[PDB]
Design a protein around this motif. Structure first.
Motif, PDB file in Angstrom:
ATOM      1  N   UNK A  48     -63.312 -50.700  42.398  1.00  0.00           N
ATOM      2  CA  UNK A  48     -62.830 -51.038  41.058  1.00  0.00           C
ATOM      3  C   UNK A  48     -62.430 -49.773  40.273  1.00  0.00           C
ATOM      4  N   UNK A  49     -63.277 -48.743  40.319  1.00  0.00           N
ATOM      5  CA  UNK A  49     -62.965 -47.461  39.686  1.00  0.00           C
ATOM      6  C   UNK A  49     -63.568 -46.410  40.572  1.00  0.00           C
ATOM      7  N   UNK A  50     -62.929 -45.233  40.617  1.00  0.00           N
ATOM      8  CA  UNK A  50     -63.327 -44.168  41.521  1.00  0.00           C
ATOM      9  C   UNK A  50     -63.000 -42.775  40.987  1.00  0.00           C
ATOM     10  N   UNK A  69     -63.817 -34.921  40.202  1.00  0.00           N
ATOM     11  CA  UNK A  69     -62.726 -34.964  39.263  1.00  0.00           C
ATOM     12  C   UNK A  69     -62.430 -36.409  39.069  1.00  0.00           C
ATOM     13  N   UNK A  70     -62.062 -36.735  37.837  1.00  0.00           N
ATOM     14  CA  UNK A  70     -61.702 -38.048  37.434  1.00  0.00           C
ATOM     15  C   UNK A  70     -60.217 -38.164  37.496  1.00  0.00           C
ATOM     16  N   UNK A  94     -55.091 -35.724  38.736  1.00  0.00           N
ATOM     17  CA  UNK A  94     -56.415 -35.541  38.224  1.00  0.00           C
ATOM     18  C   UNK A  94     -56.426 -35.293  36.681  1.00  0.00           C
ATOM     19  N   UNK A  95     -57.432 -35.801  35.960  1.00  0.00           N
ATOM     20  CA  UNK A  95     -57.598 -35.360  34.559  1.00  0.00           C
ATOM     21  C   UNK A  95     -57.769 -33.847  34.475  1.00  0.00           C
ATOM     22  N   UNK A  96     -58.582 -33.236  35.342  1.00  0.00           N
ATOM     23  CA  UNK A  96     -58.778 -31.769  35.247  1.00  0.00           C
ATOM     24  C   UNK A  96     -58.353 -31.098  36.564  1.00  0.00           C
ATOM     25  N   UNK A  97     -57.809 -29.873  36.487  1.00  0.00           N
ATOM     26  CA  UNK A  97     -57.231 -29.264  37.690  1.00  0.00           C
ATOM     27  C   UNK A  97     -58.317 -28.859  38.663  1.00  0.00           C
ATOM     28  N   UNK A  98     -58.037 -28.966  39.952  1.00  0.00           N
ATOM     29  CA  UNK A  98     -58.903 -28.412  40.971  1.00  0.00           C
ATOM     30  C   UNK A  98     -58.957 -26.882  40.909  1.00  0.00           C
TER      31      UNK A  98
END
Ligand SMILES: CC(C)C[C@@H]1CN(S(=O)(=O)c2cc3cc(Cl)ccc3[nH]2)CCN1C(=O)c1ncc(-c2ccncc2)cn1
Ligand SMILES: [Ca+2]
Ligand SMILES: [Ca+2]
Lengths: 233, 54
Positions: A48-50, A69-70, A94-98
């Motif tokens: 459902x969400x991951x 990461x989201x 991704x919301x935030x960079x790797x």
């Protein structure tokens, strides 16, 4: 992965793992850049969400060097079909960079014609994952890799109960007990050239895992290079 | 009769193209073509396609 070897320190750095609400791995992915992960569209129905985990080798412990990461944006191919498995490809922003580091780094995207003329004509590529260790087994806690020969298109349509589209390609072994398996899906297939690894496929499906006379079926990344580009903007 | 990109990737480290009747080499994102115009040199660390280990 069935058979294969462990990825040793630094060897499979482009591997991402998608993890469900229970923080359990259900599918793999390939890091393309600090913001974008490549996976299979069929993986986005398995939860459902991951979130996305990177830099993990051993999901049992915490090495340090791992990061969740989201996902900010899911781009699923418009044509994906649960029923044929055709266009089995999605990109996640991704919301935030790797943060690249040891065990975390991108695989290169090839150019189309070069990839098809040179990469897909090598003998083998490497597929990797936290997936199941036999058809009837449990998911691996160590990250594994496996060298898989390209399979001739014809043979592989001949072997297949289902249609092999032009978006797919076959790799693996007719009889040897080595193959990707449940859990490895969406994961990387990369082909080495000189000393650079290029993404060539996405673990999509197979009839069982490591069955005799059956192969692994991969999404043909070269068919979607322009699309991946668009997606990444 | 194996020529240009078909002969050992035309000496290119990465992408080769037969353009006119000569080889033009080029490199994935995050690399630059060396002065010799065949080799691909990483512009940062964590270039794509490298194991984090050497
Ligand atoms: C079973 C095997 N799996 S699996 O164990 O998750 C699996 C994934 C995978 C990837 C590779 Cl590269 C090798 C092995 C492998 N095994 C998928 C569903 N199954 C099926 O058997 C199945 N899959 C697909 C379809 C299908 C394919 C194409 N069009 C329609 C249905 C039917 N049955
Ligand atoms: Ca760990
Ligand atoms: Ca087989």
């Amino acid at each position: 992965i069935v058979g294969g070897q462990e990825c040793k320190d630094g060897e499979c750095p482009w591997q991402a793992l998608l993890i469900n609400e229970e923080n359990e791995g259900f599918c793999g992915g390939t890091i393309l850049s600090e913001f974008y992960i490549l996976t299979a569209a069929h993986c986005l129905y398995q939860a459902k969400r991951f979130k996305v985990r990177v830099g993990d080798r051993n999901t049992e412990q915490e090495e340090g060097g791992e990061a969740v990461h989201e996902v900010e944006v899911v781009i699923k191919h418009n044509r994906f079909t649960k029923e044929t498995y055709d266009f089995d490809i999605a990109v996640l922003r991704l919301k935030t960079p790797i943060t690249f580091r040891m065990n975390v780094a991108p695989a290169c995207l090839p150019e189309r014609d070069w990839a098809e003329s040179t990469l897909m004509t090598q003998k083998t590529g490497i597929v990797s994952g936290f997936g199941r260790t036999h058809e009837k087994g449990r998911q691996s806690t160590r990250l594994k890799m496996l060298e898989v020969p390209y399979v001739d298109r014809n043979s592989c349509k001949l072997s297949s109960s289902f249609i092999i589209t032009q978006n797919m390609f076959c790799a693996g072994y007719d009889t040897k007990q080595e193959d990707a398996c449940q859990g490895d899906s969406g994961g990387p297939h990369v082909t080495r050239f000189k000393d650079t690894y290029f993404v060539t496929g996405i673990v999509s499906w197979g009839e069982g895992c490591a069955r005799k006379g059956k192969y692994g079926i991969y999404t043909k990344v070269t068919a979607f290079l322009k699309w991946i580009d668009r997606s990444m903007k | 009769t194996r020529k240009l990109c078909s002969l050992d990737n035309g000496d290119c480290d990465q992408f080769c193209h037969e353009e006119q009747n000569s080889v033009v080499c080029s490199c994935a994102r995050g690399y630059t073509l060396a002065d010799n115009g065949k080799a691909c040199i990483p512009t940062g660390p964590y270039p794509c396609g490298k194991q984090t280990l050497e």
